[PDB]
Amino acid sequence: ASRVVVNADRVKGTINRNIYGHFSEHLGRCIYEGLWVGEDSPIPNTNGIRNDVLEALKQMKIPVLHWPGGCFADEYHWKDGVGPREKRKRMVNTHVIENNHFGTHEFMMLCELLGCEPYISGNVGSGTVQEMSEWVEYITFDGESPMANWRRENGREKPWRIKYWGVGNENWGCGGNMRAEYYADLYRQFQTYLRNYGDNKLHKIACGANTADYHWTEVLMKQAAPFMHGLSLHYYTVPGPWEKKGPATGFTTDEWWVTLKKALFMDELVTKHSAIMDVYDPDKRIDLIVDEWGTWYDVEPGTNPGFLYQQNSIRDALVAGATLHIFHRHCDRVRMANIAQLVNVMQSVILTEGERMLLTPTYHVFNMFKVHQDAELLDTWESVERTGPEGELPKVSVSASRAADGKIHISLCNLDFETGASVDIELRGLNGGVSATGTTLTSGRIDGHNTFDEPERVKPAPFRDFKLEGGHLNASLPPMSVTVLELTAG
Amino acid sequence: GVGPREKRKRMVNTHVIENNHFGTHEFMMLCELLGCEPYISGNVGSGTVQEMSEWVEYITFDGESPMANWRRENGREKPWRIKYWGVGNENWGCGGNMRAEYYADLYRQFQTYLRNYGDNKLHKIACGANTADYHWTEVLMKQAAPFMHGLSLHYYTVPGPW
Amino acid sequence: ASRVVVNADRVKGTINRNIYGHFSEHLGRCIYEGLWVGEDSPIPNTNGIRNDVLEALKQMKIPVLHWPGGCFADEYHWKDGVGPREKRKRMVNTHVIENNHFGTHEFMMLCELLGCEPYISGNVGSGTVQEMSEWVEYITFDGESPMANWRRENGREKPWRIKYWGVGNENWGCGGNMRAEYYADLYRQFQTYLRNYGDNKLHKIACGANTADYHWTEVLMKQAAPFMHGLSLHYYTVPGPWEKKGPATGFTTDEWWVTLKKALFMDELVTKHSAIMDVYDPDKRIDLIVDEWGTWYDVEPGTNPGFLYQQNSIRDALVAGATLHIFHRHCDRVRMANIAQLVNVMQSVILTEGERMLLTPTYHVFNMFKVHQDAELLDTWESVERTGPEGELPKVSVSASRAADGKIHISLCNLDFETGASVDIELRGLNGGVSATGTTLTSGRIDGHNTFDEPERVKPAPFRDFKLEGGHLNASLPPMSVTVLELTAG
């Protein structure tokens, strides 16, 4: 038995809802087919966006969406994506179509339809200071100017509000192959000209490190902390070497254990990057933003490697659940995260094929865990069984929060695919008794996944395999599972 | 230096005429007539990253885009091939009076956006030292070696003082 | 009412007993009169060391003693303090007498009599590498050599054992006015030649920062971490400006509040220095050693400013109690501390006047808190009343630990001199019921102190003003007090 104590009356922090964020690049079929079908598509759509996906994402309570993020942000020139559809810039490669039908107006519309915060990244690597300044002005200025007037011409009279603004992305790599010292100087310069217009308040985000580049964090904090509201971090879970990452399905048990071990490395990265941030920002003013994370496999056989299409199994659900738990544990500093990527690209919550779609196991974890969004983290301590071939992994990952209505949610991941996991949970600091319901997500196969023909092989089901004798909640978690228990006082 | 030769930019000084009648199309044609490799240097000192990126695209892209379409309107249907591409010239002097440390950063940034289109393969060349500026070579090798295929050097034989 | 919860079953670490350490320099009457009286002194003594002090210190359970530490360590040449006591070096200033009768043999003997660990600092500033190397050899080598043979001739046949070895002290100041970069190089060089002889194991300690010199910590960690077991830190509580610090007694209420606020600054210093250490030493291999701390006042009127003699009030007891609590809270990294200084110098536990001595309020806190030595720190959380003219200070400082015999000790400081402090303590994670006794140390004057004529105005007394109704311990702490509750299961 793994043992847990929940101090239901000790709040340790707030889980910012933006921890549950998402990210979409102009890449493969993430924007085009995934979301954007066009107004006259036979696929039922609202203003050009397919309804099946909209409804699923609203249900999931998507808090924030990052666009254009990834390598494309430091390639993109935003003016190419506004104005009359047919004068929008067209790029066609025969080896891939970018028509720029999806641009700033369509993105802001999409966010309003979803009820999520927009998070835009401007172009540092191939952009200019004036260009980025003008984008913010276009979006947020209530006065009279070429840019604000242009926004009005293009159909949006009043400005939008936007908080999250990224000043470049991946500037150490595809965003300019920059030394940290150099990017910090560009960052300081660019951010200067991003104004707060009207009652808008920008939340300027500097591009942070790739994986274990601690030097980057040090330099950005030391040189640029006073000029930023947030600093990003990127870490992908890649089972195999770069040149042979391994497949999304039909993988070996070694690949299971490696995948989960690599996912849990997030905790170390976040710990060590935060420790550096603490030196320069002891009050933790500046957010840590893990705006690229998730699994990265070889593409599905006979798909274009460039489109990054991969399946999504219960393995991916465990990665997501455990990784979100890690963000919980760091919710004193980590205030946003964004899984790569929303639709048809990397560790997506949704895959599409024409008018058909499915919800991935990854979708189900986001949907189950939405109870943690803006919840109060509760003090828990735990002593858990080990698993994996050398006892390398924790058998169980657990996290507890308190929702605004006073309900308590306890989410638990069983990382062992082979056997269930017993957990005794002791609840302290309660007033009344409590009752509990539960939901669980599991599979009969290590690589269990949904398909267009069978979109529901892997989905949440009622969870009843626990007993609550006031004070102790004993549970038998299924193998390879993610479970949420809801406790109500009374 | 591209588009209808009569409507190209003209600069005249009486103290020298540049009418830009010789531009990209004329140069690439000259190289085809000679059977020689073209070696173009882009503008770092007073240029932008987008400008240099678009020049490569204009010349080498086989698809549909504003730049490739512009090449076609200007009379060259299929792209050209080019290997040798200089990312600035004389950047220690008349190309921006740059410290090596600073040029290396611009070099890394500019080179990033110079793509291999079609079956074209770029040979990216960083601006190297003037004469015995060994410090320049050291900085460019140390800070930028992974991002270059070649590094230049300049030395004129000048008998008397400057 | 301040509120506290003790999770009597959640251990958060071990309070290294060396947190309760002490420090004596050859300065004023710390060594001469305070400890060392000589064998045929009329003051009752064991081998030249006064018995009154020995017994008091043994009772207090002195864990470690640092000598010669302070500025003297990087002035001292250890060979001057060995050999026939009568034919050793004499230095006299008339503007102070050093006869070197107290040297290495006497120090090692003192530590054996007290049962404490010796902590010696070698001379970097004015010493040589061979000199320091030979000191260790002299002390620890069991074989045949000039140094070990010399130790034998000087009356110690078998070597002594020593762990704690300081490689210079105060090297940023009176120990050579060194840049951190430079001291790190000398550190690396000197430490190389400090050998482990026989079964002896050295614990090499590098000189760390003064106060908020975070750069020093960074440099020493970055350049020297692999070559050290510990890094020191210094911080004195100085009420007024350097030139006019303020008196030990007859001080104003403003001086009370300033004193305590400056003492609590220790938590910030320790937090920030530790944060830097975490970056270079994430596993916390390297001890942080706060080997100079305590209050520093103007000397008693008409005493030599150079002898650093100051009185010791209930204010000093509060500084000690609160400061030791701060070390508890940082016992994951802080593993030794040493209050300045033992006898007749700065914030001493003992004052002497010939054969008469007293125990200071500071002594009483060390003696009362000895229950925390090598105890397991327990998870507590608290919500405490404020005090002080702007609500700047916590009214109450509290810490709880579990001793080896399973008893629980809860120590509490009331920083308000003006009114008592109600505290409700909830105990969780107990099996049985518990009974409790208590001790408290308080005074009727804000500057209440002991004198040679009245050595017991301020001393521990039974504390009975609390009720334990199973689960909750409600207590009424006297004004300006330090209290310890011992809880027994049953």
mmCIF file of N, CA and C in Angstrom, chain C residues 21 23 233-239 245 259 262-263 266 290-297 310 312 315-316 319-321 323-324 327 337-341 345-348 362 366:
data_model
loop_
_atom_site.group_PDB
_atom_site.id
_atom_site.type_symbol
_atom_site.label_atom_id
_atom_site.label_comp_id
_atom_site.label_asym_id
_atom_site.label_seq_id
_atom_site.Cartn_x
_atom_site.Cartn_y
_atom_site.Cartn_z
ATOM 1 N N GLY C 21 26.463 25.400 18.628
ATOM 2 C CA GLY C 21 27.875 25.577 18.821
ATOM 3 C C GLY C 21 28.258 26.931 19.369
ATOM 4 N N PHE C 23 31.993 29.644 20.173
ATOM 5 C CA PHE C 23 33.154 30.177 19.534
ATOM 6 C C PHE C 23 33.941 31.002 20.550
ATOM 7 N N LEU C 233 29.317 31.489 7.211
ATOM 8 C CA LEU C 233 28.585 32.734 7.050
ATOM 9 C C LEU C 233 28.668 33.490 8.373
ATOM 10 N N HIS C 234 28.778 34.816 8.302
ATOM 11 C CA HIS C 234 28.849 35.683 9.478
ATOM 12 C C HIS C 234 27.721 36.715 9.427
ATOM 13 N N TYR C 235 27.035 36.906 10.555
ATOM 14 C CA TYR C 235 26.064 37.994 10.701
ATOM 15 C C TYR C 235 25.862 38.378 12.175
ATOM 16 N N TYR C 236 26.254 39.607 12.506
ATOM 17 C CA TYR C 236 26.047 40.231 13.802
ATOM 18 C C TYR C 236 24.802 41.138 13.786
ATOM 19 N N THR C 237 24.030 41.076 14.869
ATOM 20 C CA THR C 237 22.921 41.956 15.161
ATOM 21 C C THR C 237 23.454 43.201 15.894
ATOM 22 N N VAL C 238 23.510 44.319 15.159
ATOM 23 C CA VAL C 238 24.048 45.584 15.626
ATOM 24 C C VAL C 238 22.933 46.616 15.618
ATOM 25 N N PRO C 239 22.382 47.003 16.798
ATOM 26 C CA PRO C 239 21.195 47.856 16.842
ATOM 27 C C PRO C 239 21.405 49.208 16.146
ATOM 28 N N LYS C 245 26.574 51.849 18.707
ATOM 29 C CA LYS C 245 25.767 50.657 18.500
ATOM 30 C C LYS C 245 24.561 50.635 19.434
ATOM 31 N N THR C 259 16.487 45.797 17.575
ATOM 32 C CA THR C 259 17.360 44.714 17.853
ATOM 33 C C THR C 259 16.746 43.431 17.291
ATOM 34 N N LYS C 262 16.533 43.264 13.446
ATOM 35 C CA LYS C 262 17.823 42.998 12.847
ATOM 36 C C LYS C 262 18.218 41.537 13.072
ATOM 37 N N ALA C 263 17.847 40.965 14.228
ATOM 38 C CA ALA C 263 18.196 39.576 14.465
ATOM 39 C C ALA C 263 17.489 38.655 13.461
ATOM 40 N N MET C 266 18.505 37.363 9.876
ATOM 41 C CA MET C 266 19.237 36.151 9.688
ATOM 42 C C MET C 266 18.460 35.217 8.761
ATOM 43 N N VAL C 290 27.027 28.816 10.207
ATOM 44 C CA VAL C 290 26.908 30.175 10.606
ATOM 45 C C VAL C 290 27.774 30.366 11.860
ATOM 46 N N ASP C 291 29.087 30.517 11.651
ATOM 47 C CA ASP C 291 30.014 30.368 12.784
ATOM 48 C C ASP C 291 30.307 31.711 13.447
ATOM 49 N N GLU C 292 29.653 32.801 13.033
ATOM 50 C CA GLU C 292 29.624 34.004 13.814
ATOM 51 C C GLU C 292 28.232 34.625 13.728
ATOM 52 N N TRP C 293 27.588 34.710 14.896
ATOM 53 C CA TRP C 293 26.345 35.390 15.053
ATOM 54 C C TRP C 293 26.173 35.872 16.507
ATOM 55 N N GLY C 294 25.183 36.735 16.720
ATOM 56 C CA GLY C 294 24.870 37.296 18.030
ATOM 57 C C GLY C 294 24.872 38.816 18.006
ATOM 58 N N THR C 295 24.529 39.381 19.173
ATOM 59 C CA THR C 295 24.392 40.830 19.330
ATOM 60 C C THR C 295 25.762 41.449 19.594
ATOM 61 N N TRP C 296 25.916 42.667 19.104
ATOM 62 C CA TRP C 296 27.094 43.450 19.261
ATOM 63 C C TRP C 296 26.686 44.876 19.668
ATOM 64 N N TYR C 297 26.942 45.197 20.948
ATOM 65 C CA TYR C 297 26.655 46.497 21.555
ATOM 66 C C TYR C 297 27.954 47.274 21.797
ATOM 67 N N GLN C 310 30.267 43.192 27.098
ATOM 68 C CA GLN C 310 28.909 43.741 27.087
ATOM 69 C C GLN C 310 28.039 42.854 27.978
ATOM 70 N N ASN C 312 24.092 41.340 29.085
ATOM 71 C CA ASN C 312 23.343 40.278 28.483
ATOM 72 C C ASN C 312 21.983 40.241 29.207
ATOM 73 N N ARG C 315 16.533 40.630 26.335
ATOM 74 C CA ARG C 315 16.589 40.969 24.903
ATOM 75 C C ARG C 315 17.508 39.960 24.179
ATOM 76 N N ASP C 316 18.662 39.678 24.786
ATOM 77 C CA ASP C 316 19.647 38.777 24.229
ATOM 78 C C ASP C 316 19.090 37.350 24.212
ATOM 79 N N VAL C 319 16.851 37.180 21.187
ATOM 80 C CA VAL C 319 17.670 37.101 19.971
ATOM 81 C C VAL C 319 18.156 35.659 19.786
ATOM 82 N N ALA C 320 18.613 35.043 20.867
ATOM 83 C CA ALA C 320 19.169 33.717 20.738
ATOM 84 C C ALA C 320 18.061 32.740 20.376
ATOM 85 N N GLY C 321 16.941 32.829 21.086
ATOM 86 C CA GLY C 321 15.872 31.875 20.894
ATOM 87 C C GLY C 321 15.317 31.952 19.487
ATOM 88 N N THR C 323 16.805 33.228 16.811
ATOM 89 C CA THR C 323 17.834 32.921 15.867
ATOM 90 C C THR C 323 17.995 31.409 15.768
ATOM 91 N N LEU C 324 17.991 30.721 16.905
ATOM 92 C CA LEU C 324 18.110 29.267 16.881
ATOM 93 C C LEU C 324 16.882 28.644 16.190
ATOM 94 N N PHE C 327 17.605 28.756 12.565
ATOM 95 C CA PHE C 327 18.489 27.657 12.180
ATOM 96 C C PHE C 327 17.708 26.353 12.059
ATOM 97 N N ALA C 337 26.266 26.197 13.881
ATOM 98 C CA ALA C 337 26.307 27.621 14.165
ATOM 99 C C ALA C 337 27.070 27.849 15.470
ATOM 100 N N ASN C 338 27.614 29.054 15.624
ATOM 101 C CA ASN C 338 28.521 29.342 16.702
ATOM 102 C C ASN C 338 28.297 30.780 17.121
ATOM 103 N N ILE C 339 27.703 30.924 18.305
ATOM 104 C CA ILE C 339 27.426 32.262 18.810
ATOM 105 C C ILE C 339 28.733 32.884 19.316
ATOM 106 N N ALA C 340 28.857 34.177 19.046
ATOM 107 C CA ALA C 340 30.035 34.975 19.388
ATOM 108 C C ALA C 340 29.742 35.743 20.681
ATOM 109 N N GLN C 341 30.551 35.561 21.721
ATOM 110 C CA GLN C 341 31.558 34.532 21.912
ATOM 111 C C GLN C 341 31.305 33.988 23.319
ATOM 112 N N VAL C 345 32.892 38.109 26.207
ATOM 113 C CA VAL C 345 33.065 38.745 24.878
ATOM 114 C C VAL C 345 31.768 38.634 24.082
ATOM 115 N N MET C 346 31.211 39.799 23.775
ATOM 116 C CA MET C 346 29.988 39.945 22.949
ATOM 117 C C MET C 346 28.844 39.164 23.631
ATOM 118 N N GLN C 347 28.075 38.341 22.899
ATOM 119 C CA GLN C 347 26.846 37.767 23.472
ATOM 120 C C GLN C 347 27.178 36.441 24.159
ATOM 121 N N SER C 348 27.859 36.539 25.304
ATOM 122 C CA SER C 348 28.399 35.369 25.993
ATOM 123 C C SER C 348 27.318 34.652 26.790
ATOM 124 N N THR C 362 21.292 34.451 27.919
ATOM 125 C CA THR C 362 21.644 33.725 26.720
ATOM 126 C C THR C 362 21.993 32.279 27.092
ATOM 127 N N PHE C 366 20.296 28.525 25.686
ATOM 128 C CA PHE C 366 21.024 27.381 25.173
ATOM 129 C C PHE C 366 20.723 26.143 26.012
#
